[PDB]
Symmetry: C3
Subunit: 106 residues, 3 copies
């Protein structure tokens, strides 16, 4: 999918995590977020459509999605241990990263 639709997916699943009731729901949401972030890593965001795929700006963009992938992993590790509240709290900081990426690259 294109970058904007991947970003929609990330936001939708953040809402899911915020309102989630059990560890299975959080883990499902976070797995969908990981897939969307990995797919967005192959995309070009609107702000960088005037940059080449191997420009420093596009390399920095892809590293930004690596960073997000590791933050998703932290929440997912919490959810695998049954720590639903701690995973939701970790997802609070995912929202910060996602919002900043939206503002930076749209």
């Amino acid at each position: 999918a294109d970058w904007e639709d991947n970003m929609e997916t990330l936001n939708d699943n953040l809402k899911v995590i915020e309102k989630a009731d059990n560890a299975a729901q959080v883990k499902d949401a976070l797995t969908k977020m990981r897939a969307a972030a990995l797919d967005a890593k192959k995309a070009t965001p609107p702000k960088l459509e005037d940059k080449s795929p191997a420009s420093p700006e596009m390399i920095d963009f892809r590293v930004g999605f690596d960073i997000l992938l590791w933050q998703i992993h932290d929440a997912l590790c919490l959810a695998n241990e049954g720590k639903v509240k701690e995973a939701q709290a970790a997802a609070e900081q995912l929202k910060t990263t996602v919002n900043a990426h939206w503002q930076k690259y749209r």
Copy 2:
């Protein structure tokens, strides 16, 4: 080593997993698979040897290895919780991803 050699190492450790009985064996084989996949991630596969290093095709190649690494991680997580049967089933799916990448870029 060679990209082709790394694909071979992935398959040898996949068989090792499928014939395993305890979680430590599966973890060992998955760790070797992770190392092979990271070593292959920096390669130029045969199909892409005529393309610029800056080509989008090479970026998609490397992000495909990131997808494989996260699948390896999920199998490793299952093994590190002693769920050796679930880990073996996840590694049967890894056979698909690994050999699909092999066949895509050879």
Copy 3:
């Protein structure tokens, strides 16, 4: 930060881990190491300043940080389970990888 500064952060936190008392300190140092490795993926070593950002040499450089990141992940997973001694042993092997990367690219 530039590349040498990130590598300094990695080494300072390896020392913190080597001397650490409890899991909280180990985990904090390991999360700083992860952030430094990811940030270093956006840097360029001086001797590679004349190469394409997607050149095989620069790919090798960034993937070397991916190798470090997955080793950091293993140590951080151990630390999150209270396995302080195992995390410190894994950090001792992190030092070898860090120093090899340093020697290769400085």
